[PDB]
Amino acid sequence: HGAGVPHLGIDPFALDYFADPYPEQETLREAGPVVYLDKWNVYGVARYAEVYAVLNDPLTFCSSRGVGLSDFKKEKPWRPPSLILEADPPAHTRTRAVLSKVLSPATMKRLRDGFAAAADAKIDELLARGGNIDAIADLAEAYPLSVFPDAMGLKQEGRENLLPYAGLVFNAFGPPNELRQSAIERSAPHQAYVAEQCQRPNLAPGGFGACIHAFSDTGEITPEEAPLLVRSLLSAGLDTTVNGIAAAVYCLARFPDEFARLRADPSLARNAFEEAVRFESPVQTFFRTTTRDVELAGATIGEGEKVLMFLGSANRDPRRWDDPDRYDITRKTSGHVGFGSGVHMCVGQLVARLEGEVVLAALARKVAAIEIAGPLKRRFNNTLRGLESLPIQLTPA
Numbered sequence: 001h002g003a004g005v006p007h008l009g010i011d012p013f014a015l016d017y018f019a020d021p022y023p024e025q026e027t028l029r030e031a032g033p034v035v036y037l038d039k040w041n042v043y044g045v046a047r048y049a050e051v052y053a054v055l056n057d058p059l060t061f062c063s064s065r066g067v068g069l070s071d072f073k074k075e076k077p078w079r080p081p082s083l084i085l086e087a088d089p090p091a092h093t094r095t096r097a098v099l100s101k102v103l104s105p106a107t108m109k110r111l112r113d114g115f116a117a118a119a120d121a122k123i124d125e126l127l128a129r130g131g132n133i134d135a136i137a138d139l140a141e142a143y144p145l146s147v148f149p150d151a152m153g154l155k156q157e158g159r160e161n162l163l164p165y166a167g168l169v170f171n172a173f174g175p176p177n178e179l180r181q182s183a184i185e186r187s188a189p190h191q192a193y194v195a196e197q198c199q200r201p202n203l204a205p206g207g208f209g210a211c212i213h214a215f216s217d218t219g220e221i222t223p224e225e226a227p228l229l230v231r232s233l234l235s236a237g238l239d240t241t242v243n244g245i246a247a248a249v250y251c252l253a254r255f256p257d258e259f260a261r262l263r264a265d266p267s268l269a270r271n272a273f274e275e276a277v278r279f280e281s282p283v284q285t286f287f288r289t290t291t292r293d294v295e296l297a298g299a300t301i302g303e304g305e306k307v308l309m310f311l312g313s314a315n316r317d318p319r320r321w322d323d324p325d326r327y328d329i330t331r332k333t334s335g336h337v338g339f340g341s342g343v344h345m346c347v348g349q350l351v352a353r354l355e356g357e358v359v360l361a362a363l364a365r366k367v368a369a370i371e372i373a374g375p376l377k378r379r380f381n382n383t384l385r386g387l388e389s390l391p392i393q394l395t396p397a
């Protein structure tokens, strides 16, 4: 295995790596376009060129064998494969089409005012207590926990267990380590509870959930698939959105001159969030599995091989980005892989962007200055990058 390519001892699932990932991500890029990780016996690609290429060759680098370390072809799935994320065309085309229609631009346009109003109120609220708050619990998590479940049609009370439930999702794409084991145990007590809220009788009319269920009535999807697709949105959208808003606030808080540009021109809100996604990519990695013997950037990769993609690294590859390590809210961000690329490119990106834009717009208008006011605590996850705590001080406009 790994014949003809550079072998490395880098551990992409170690907490030491998660705590300070950039130096090693650079090592991965400089070693070659294709490397082999001896600690896990899997191939890896960290440059923008190859990551983009692989993501856009869904036939060759499939997702139906799992986007995690396990090969669902060779091994009986230890967890049920996602009917959307871990499906290849044409199956994927069918379930994707439903979600794509439900999370359309027209839908976002209808939700915009409500999302903005909630954002403005949240910021006024935070300022009222004083600027001294935790950007994670009080904003990165609080804001989406309000508007996202609302748009989904989930009940108002008991949202306290959505994150505990959602923590399993992306950790499950990693090996059976302590992070994985802890997320499973933390999620267990809420599994049945959250699944129940995704059944048709429990969804508020008009929300994402109810609209998805309507597709059961026509035949596009079965009554059994419907609640699973609904739950997939929650799973795929909670930690990612929290980490996304967290990254944007973290970036603007650490680089005051960029927040100054934003305040001077609030219309940069959407791009400041997009740049935050490129710079501090919520979804750092995940796998694809080869379905045939292939040639990739000079390397020979056999069929049935797991390939680990580093989206964060691709988003900071100097071969593609000028001054990659600089957070620039006016940067031309088009092309970054923070939401992936190709047939699987985040079907929920418009929702995520709406939320992010709206939060940063409220900040740009209501806050005069932002500063980190205490020790930062990073949230460790097998495939995601995020913060557990970020004390900051918001100065009123």
Ligand code: HEM
Binding pocket: 063, 067, 084, 085, 086, 096, 099, 103, 232, 233, 234, 236, 237, 238, 240, 241, 243, 244, 245, 277, 281, 282, 283, 286, 337, 338, 339, 340, 341, 343, 344, 345, 346, 347, 348, 349, 351, 352
């Ligand atoms: C900052 C926010 C977000 C980021 C950075 C993000 C990133 C991603 C990435 C990188 C993928 C690709 C996985 C692959 O190719 O295997 C993905 C897929 C997906 N995401 Fe997002 N995500 C975000 C928010 C959301 C939200 C809020 C939702 C729910 C509305 C969501 C629903 C999905 C779904 C359903 C897929 C699978 C699409 C398919 O397989 O066709 N995501 N996301």
